[PDB]
Structure 1
Amino acid sequence: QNITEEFYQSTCSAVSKGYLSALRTGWYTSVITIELSNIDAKVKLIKQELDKYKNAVTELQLLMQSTPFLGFLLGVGSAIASGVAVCKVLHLEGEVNKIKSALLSTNKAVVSLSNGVSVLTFKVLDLKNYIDKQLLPIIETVIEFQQKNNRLLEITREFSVNAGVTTPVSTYMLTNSELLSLINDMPITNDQKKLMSNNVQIVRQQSYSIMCIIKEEVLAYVVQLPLYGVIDTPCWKLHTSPLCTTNTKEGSNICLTRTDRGWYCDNAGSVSFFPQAETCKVQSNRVFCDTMNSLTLPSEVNLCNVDIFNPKYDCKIMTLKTDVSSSVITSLGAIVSCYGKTKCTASNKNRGIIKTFSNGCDYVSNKGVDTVSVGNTLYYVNKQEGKSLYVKGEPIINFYDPLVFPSDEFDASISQVNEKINQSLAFIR
């Protein structure tokens, strides 16, 4: 919609802002059911296709016994725990029969379970009605039985190669018409209904299908859908690249890299920080993330982009000497960390080189630039529309005396480096 991006020459980092949040805060668990039947050449094909039915039920029975930079700081939880709790209820006596009763006259029904969870239950395939009413005979019957048995066969195979938990949720587990109607009857706000409906493919990837139970001639599996409790708050993506001195002797050079790269989103007076930005999915200017992949930081962490030396937040950096050249493709441009004898250029679609990077950390916007070359690596830039702003600044690495600079600090900060410099300075005195 309106994406902007600022590059900070002083800290060799860039922030892409203008995005809107869609953060997964809750789960909606629904129970999907398939009603099963206990049981010339046109008849031989029927028994062969019926053996597929009996082998799929055996697999599901034999599968039901299988009960369901700063990223290392993250917590540890189970993503499907709320879906497992619903599945544990279905194993209670008379609970599957409660679902079987509510879907007797209709396909969509809201069922309140014995543990108080009111789930929205679906009957998506009626194979007991088909197989039992067409059990009288034992080519038109052969083809239509393969079409109705196909969904059961594919649901079973997806569960077989995924321990009974699949993500993203396929059209076999839940069709678009079923998912769209499930969203409409879902007890959520109108903003969440419009968001999930306009992005059903993202909803599928952040959803789970959990194989549950097959008893009393009923196959039931749990589809666990994301609930976005945070919508339309500001998000911004922080890109970082190593910032080194560019002296002629490489042994006297020191480096510094901001380690707080990832996705940031405003959330409930704090900031939700996703250190491994691969765990978020971007749709135009909407970013979908799971709060399980996040750290909760003070909102003052944003100040590191403006003044990395601010007294309100201890900005995190590393000081590993990384004297090799690399590039980071941002949202609207490219950061280039060019060091040593590496050839660092930016080229245009048809004409070739239009910018030659010198040693140090620099930036080029994607306007009129299509590729970036660093050594023998060719990078294509993102061609999304948006404005880039180059914030000139003295590289902060030039403020440090190399003789007392603490190199090889893995997870440090501005204050930690300041503290270690004083100790070394004390030894000098």
Structure 2
Amino acid sequence: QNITEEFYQSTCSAVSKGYLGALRTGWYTSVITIELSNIKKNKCNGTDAKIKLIKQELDKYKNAVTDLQLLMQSTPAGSAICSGVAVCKVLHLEGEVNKIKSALLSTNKAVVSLSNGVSVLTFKVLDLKNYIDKQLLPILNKQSCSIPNIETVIEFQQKNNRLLEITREFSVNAGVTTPVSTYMLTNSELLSLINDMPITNDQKKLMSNNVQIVRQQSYSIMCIIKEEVLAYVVQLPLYGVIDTPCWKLHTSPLCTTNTKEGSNICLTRTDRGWYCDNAGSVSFFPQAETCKVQSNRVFCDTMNSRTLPSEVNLCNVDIFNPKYDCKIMTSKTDVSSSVITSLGAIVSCYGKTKCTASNKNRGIIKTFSNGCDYVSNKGVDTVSVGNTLYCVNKQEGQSLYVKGEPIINFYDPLVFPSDEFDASISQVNEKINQSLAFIRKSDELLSAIGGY
């Protein structure tokens, strides 16, 4: 709970510890089905505008059905669609739709087993067949075609609205929509579906605590419109790991303090992003889009994750440790820049650029020197560098400043590499040596000038 964000001036990198992460490592697919009606012929002869509205709504329903048939013609529409595609093809086999149709005639939820050997839950969110056949179909069948109440028209429109919005979303998204809207699956229906998943109690509790992240990580693949059944596979995530120790690493450029242009060598650790513990190994997330954050609890997706040995942890507290070889980049541009951490902010100033830190009531309170320096989030509320303005987040927690000599000092600018992307400390130790070896053999050359 207590976020202890530690800043290291040795590399001027901020590591925020004490996160309770919940990685996701699989999917559970529910065949969400809507019972349609195969109505195509209208026998009504009525000029009343209420009957005209009924016919217009029915035409909209028919066009939605035709659009869904076109989307099925688009079907099949890593790990993002496979499970949906697999159920899409299975439902295309003879009788597989029929067993789902005949298994839900008594309950709105059931676990049905298909020919693929997989048993899945089949929620029946909307039953349009019953409403169409029992309420407006008798009205259409009779030659009188007398709609009894306008509220019947309003209720028909309201019931059909979910199907129309589902069709619109599928058409604009070509059958695959994410995040799952509240039309594909209502939050109440999703919560009731989480309880019926075959998972632990911890997974159900975690999912019920954060339903919004579930929607952000979810999917809704259109599968099949056939036999008065519109089935789409909503494949929710599955969190195999819960409350694992997760920590973030933010890195900022570290360049030489020399005012003269061209002598600034910039180093920036490239292992920035998220780290989590999982099965004794560290799951590394390089980009921050995958790992959402909510109240000290980080949620992460393992499709882009990289497995790493646990020793990478001592990389954070010791960049020169022989257990792991951390990742850095070497560049020449020394543009002043600010990165907003969880409990403060790192600001790197070089050249003639000015950097200030201000509180909203006390005005400007701090002026930044050359190099990368870190400021806490209490008593300082805004940081302006040059002409651009950044915040400091109001997160509460202990923040530690660690006095560390800049690692760029031990790296000589003449032999320091340029424009590198994904180097490493052991990667950047011999190309310099080779450089000195380049010097050494060149040290032979003028020796060849001297000693011949």
Question: Structure 2 length as normaliser, TM-score?
Answer: 0.91
Question: For 2:378, what is the secondary structure of its paired residue?
Answer: coil
How far did 1:369 drift? Answer: 1.7
SS of residue paired to 2:174: coil
Flag the structure with larger Rg: 2
- The yes-or-no answer on 1:32 pairing with 2:18 is no
Q: CA deviation at 1:122?
A: 1.1
Q: Distance in 1 between matches of 2:272 and 2:34?
A: 46
Task: Compute the displacement of 1:78 (Å).
Answer: 4.0
Segment drifting more, 210-219 vs 124-133: 124-133
Larger mean CA deviation between 329-338 and 300-309 belongs to: 300-309
CA offset digits 1:346-405 (Å, max 9, x no partner):
111222112111010100011122111111110112111111100101001001222222
Q: Give the stretch that moved more between structures: 91-100 or 241-250.
A: 241-250
Residues 251-279 of structure 1 show CA distances to partners (whole Å, capped at 9, x for unaligned) of 22211110000000011111000000121
1:345 maps to 356
Contact 2:84-2:223 within 8 A present in 1 as well: no
Q: Distance in 1 between matches of 2:153 and 2:339?
A: 57
Task: Give 1:135 shift.
Answer: 3.4
Query: Which residue of structure 2 lines up, in the alignment, with residue 238 of structure 1?
Result: 249
| 1:201-237 deviation digits (Å, cap 9, x = unpaired) | 1111111000110000111100000100011110000
Q: In structure 2, what is the equivalent of residue 260 of structure 1?
A: 271
Partner Cα distance (1:67, 1:58) in 2: 14
Tell me what 1:135 maps to. 136
> Please, which moves more after superposition, 406-415 or 279-288?
406-415
Provide the rounded CA distance (Å) in 2 between the counterparts of 1:409 and 1:38.
63
Select which of 327, 335, 343 maps to 2:338. Answer: 327
Shift in Å at residue 337 of structure 1? 0.9
State the shift of 1:322 in Å.
Answer: 2.4
The offset of 1:117, in angstroms, is: 1.2
The CA deviation at 1:332 is 0.7
Question: Counterpart of 1:389 in 2: which secondary structure?
Answer: strand
In structure 2, what is the equivalent of residue 16 of structure 1? 16
User: Where do residues 384-399 of structure 1 align in structure 2 (5 Å cutoff)?
Assistant: 384-399=395-410
1:110/1:118 contact within 8 Å kept: yes
The answer to whether the 8 A contact 1:331-1:384 is kept is yes
Which of 260-269 and 78-87 deviates more? 78-87
Aligned-pair CA distance for 1:80? 2.1
Distance 2:127 2:61 in 1: 13
Deviation at 1:300, TM superposition (A): 1.1
Mean Cα displacement is larger for which, 185-194 or 300-309? 300-309
Q: Output one character per residue of 1:166-222: Cα deviation in whole Å (capped at 9) or x when no partner.
A: 111111001122111101111110000000011111111111000110000111100
Structure 2 unaligned blocks of 5 or more = 40-47, 138-147, 441-452
Q: Does structure 2 retain, via aligned residues, the 8 Å contact 1:242–1:322?
A: no
* Residue 50 (str. 1) matches residue 58 (str. 2): yes
Give the TM-score normalised by the residue count of structure 1.
0.96
Which secondary structure state, in structure 1, belongs to the residue aligned with residue 328 of structure 2? strand
SS at match of 2:289: helix
1:273-301: CA deviation from partner (whole Å, max 9, x where unpaired): 00001211001011111101111111111
1:408 deviates by 2.2
Correspondence list, 1:25-424, <5 A:
25-39=25-39, 40-68=48-76, 77-136=78-137, 139-424=150-435
Give the match for residue 72 of structure 1.
none
2:259 & 2:209 partners in 1: Cα distance? 55
Segment drifting more, 232-241 vs 243-252: 243-252
Q: Aligned in 2, Cα 1:138/1:372: closer, same or farther, shift over 3 Å?
A: closer
Relative to structure 1, the CA distance from residue 167 to residue 45 in structure 2 (aligned partners, 3 Å threshold; closer, same or farther) is: same
Q: Provide the C-alpha distance between the structure 2 equivalents of 1:251 and 1:176, rounded to a whole number of angstroms.
A: 57
Asked whether the 8 Å contact 1:321–1:407 carries over to 2, the reply is yes
% identical aligned pairs: 98
CA distance in 2, matches of 1:348, 1:35: 60
- In the alignment, the residues of structure 1 paired with residue 29 and residue 429 of structure 2 have an alpha-carbon distance, to the nearest angstrom, of 50
Structure 1, residues 87-131: CA drift from partner, whole Å, max 9, x if none? 211111100011100111121111111112111111111111111
The answer as to whether partners of 2:203 and 2:239 remain within 8 angstroms in 1 is yes
- Rounded to whole Å, the distance in 1 between the matches of 2:313 and 2:14 is 12
Kept in 1, the 8 Å contact 2:353–2:386? The answer is: yes
How much has 1:67 moved relative to structure 2? 2.2
Once the two structures are TM-superposed, the CA of residue 427 in structure 1 deviates from its matched residue by 2.2
Confirm or deny: 8 A CA contact 1:245 1:397 kept in the other structure.
yes
Residue pair 1:23, 1:228 contacting (<8 A) in 2 also? yes
For residues 384 and 401 of structure 1, the distance between their equivalents in structure 2, rounded to whole angstroms, comes to 39
Q: Is the 8 A contact 1:19 1:236 kept in 2?
A: yes
SS at match of 1:225: strand
Cα distance in 2 for partners of 1:80, 1:350 equals 53
- TM-aligned CA distance change 1:138 to 1:96, over 3 Å: farther
Once the two structures are TM-superposed, the CA of residue 316 in structure 1 deviates from its matched residue by 1.2
Q: Deviations over 1:8-28 (max 9, x none)?
A: 001021100110111111100
Give how far 1:138 is off: 13
**Post-superposition CA distance 1:1-46 (Å, at most 9, x none):** 3211000001021100110111111100000011011111211110
